[PDB]
Design an enzyme around this catalytic site. Structure first.
Site, PDB file in Angstrom:
ATOM      1  N   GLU A  20       0.789  -1.221   0.000  1.00  0.00           N
ATOM      2  CA  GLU A  20       0.000   0.000   0.000  1.00  0.00           C
ATOM      3  C   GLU A  20       0.827   1.281   0.000  1.00  0.00           C
ATOM      4  OE1 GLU A  20      -2.624   1.790   0.042  1.00  0.00           O
ATOM      5  OE2 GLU A  20      -4.345   0.838   1.005  1.00  0.00           O
ATOM      6  N   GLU A  36      -0.012  -5.467   6.331  1.00  0.00           N
ATOM      7  CA  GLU A  36      -0.397  -6.796   6.777  1.00  0.00           C
ATOM      8  C   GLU A  36       0.684  -7.746   7.277  1.00  0.00           C
ATOM      9  OE1 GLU A  36      -3.400  -8.490   4.045  1.00  0.00           O
ATOM     10  OE2 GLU A  36      -3.834  -6.400   3.508  1.00  0.00           O
ATOM     11  N   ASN A 119      -6.291   5.316   7.254  1.00  0.00           N
ATOM     12  CA  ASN A 119      -5.871   4.486   6.140  1.00  0.00           C
ATOM     13  C   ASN A 119      -5.191   5.218   4.988  1.00  0.00           C
ATOM     14  OD1 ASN A 119      -6.505   3.020   3.415  1.00  0.00           O
ATOM     15  ND2 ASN A 119      -6.516   1.445   4.997  1.00  0.00           N
ATOM     16  N   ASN A 174     -11.927   5.349   2.317  1.00  0.00           N
ATOM     17  CA  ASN A 174     -10.632   4.844   1.919  1.00  0.00           C
ATOM     18  C   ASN A 174      -9.787   5.863   1.166  1.00  0.00           C
ATOM     19  OD1 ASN A 174      -8.577   3.092   1.267  1.00  0.00           O
ATOM     20  ND2 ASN A 174      -9.962   1.363   0.987  1.00  0.00           N
ATOM     21  N   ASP A 228     -10.315   1.950  -3.794  1.00  0.00           N
ATOM     22  CA  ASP A 228      -9.296   1.968  -2.764  1.00  0.00           C
ATOM     23  C   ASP A 228      -8.525   3.282  -2.914  1.00  0.00           C
ATOM     24  OD1 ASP A 228      -7.195   1.609  -1.056  1.00  0.00           O
ATOM     25  OD2 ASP A 228      -7.025  -0.550  -1.402  1.00  0.00           O
ATOM     26  N   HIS A 286      -3.072  -6.560  -4.215  1.00  0.00           N
ATOM     27  CA  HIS A 286      -3.140  -7.602  -3.204  1.00  0.00           C
ATOM     28  C   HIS A 286      -3.415  -9.026  -3.646  1.00  0.00           C
ATOM     29  CE1 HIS A 286      -4.219  -4.072  -0.309  1.00  0.00           C
ATOM     30  NE2 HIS A 286      -2.986  -4.000  -0.778  1.00  0.00           N
TER      31      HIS A 286
END
Ligand SMILES: [Ca+2]
Ligand SMILES: [Ca+2]
Length: 313
Positions: A20, A36, A119, A174, A228, A286
């Site tokens: 990201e 993550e 985020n 987002n 996103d 992802h």
């Protein structure tokens, strides 16, 4: 039928969990975050610098506050100093130096409320930082996210250092972007609400002052996911990663429905960023947790860090 283009995508690097927040600093260095990454089931997110020549990675920061690991997810480079502002789902807003040292910006907002996990963030040309906060309260509070419930918020971190909550009740806000007038004045805030397949807009009236909330655009698809990350190109076209659709949507200055789509060789495009003064767009995804790059039709809109504080014109 919406025209679709299939540009050549070149893989840059891979094996970055939740790849990201792609961003370039003032020196031209490239960074990405890995929200993550986990150690023993607990968050241990990382901030990495990537060598564009070899694709090799270097972890410069693994944010942690009082034993609570972070989940860094979005980035913006500052203008007056070469430092990164990072939105963290567990720690809120962080300011990270290129040497790896970092500082927590705020535990509470202007109204004394506990900060929510963030985020994504976007600077307007006046230096105000607009931030999306889809998570619940920051650590030590238990981790929660607004994917099902409507408790996501939007913040504006002003130039005089105030963290103001400007709106709330979003179902996972987002991506966020700021549309500027030709004279450089900020005038529209665009916010992505992922699961609802909507892009919302507000008129910017001043620092931390937004009004006229409106449904700005519609994201195609019935797949799980949605908009996103996003960014503007030099003509103010808005490119939006449609996570789960295998496409990056292209919206015109007025929004509505996409006027073009970019098909990606992967199902989950997450975020993107233009390399300064070029038409090269770096995209994180992802499905393979990797970073790719492709050539767009024109240069990107200058980021705040590319503007001059002491310019004439
Ligand atoms: Ca994001
Ligand atoms: Ca970006």
């Amino acid at each position: 039928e919406i025209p679709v283009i299939e540009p050549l995508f070149t893989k840059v690097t891979e094996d970055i969990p939740g790849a990201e927040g792609p961003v370039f600093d003032k020196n031209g260095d490239f960074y990405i975050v890995a929200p993550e990454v986990e150690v023993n089931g607990k968050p241990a997110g990382e901030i990495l610098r990537i060598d564009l020549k070899t694709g090799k990675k270097t972890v410069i920061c693994k944010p942690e506050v009082n034993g609570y690991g972070g989940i860094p997810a979005g980035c913006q480079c500052d203008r007056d100093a070469n430092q990164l502002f990072v939105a963290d789902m567990r720690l809120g807003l962080l300011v990270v130096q290129t040497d790896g040292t970092f500082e927590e910006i705020a535990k509470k907002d202007s109204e004394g409320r506990r900060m929510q996990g963030c985020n994504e963030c976007a600077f307007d040309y006046e230096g105000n930082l607009w931030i999306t906060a889809p998570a619940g309260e920051v650590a030590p509070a238990d981790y929660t996210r607004s994917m099902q419930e409507k408790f996501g918020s939007i913040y504006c971190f002003t130039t005089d250092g105030q963290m103001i909550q400007v709106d709330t009740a979003f179902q996972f806000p987002n991506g966020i972007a700021v549309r500027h007038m030709n004279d450089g004045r900020p005038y529209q805030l665009i916010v992505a609400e992922t699961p609802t397949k909507k892009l919302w807009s507000y008129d910017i009236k001043g620092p931390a002052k937004i009004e006229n909330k409106k449904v700005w655009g519609h994201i195609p698809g019935t797949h799980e996911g949605g908009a996103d990350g996003m960014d503007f190109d030099e003509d103010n076209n808005l490119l939006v990663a449609n996570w789960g659709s295998s496409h990056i949507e292209v919206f015109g200055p007025d929004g509505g429905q996409p006027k073009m789509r970019i098909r990606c060789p992967f199902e989950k495009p997450s975020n993107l960023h233009f390399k300064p003064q070029t038409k090269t767009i770096f995209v994180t995804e992802h499905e393979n947790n990797a970073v790719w790059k492709f050539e767009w039709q024109r240069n990107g809109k200058k980021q705040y860090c590319e503007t001059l504080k002491f310019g004439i014109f």
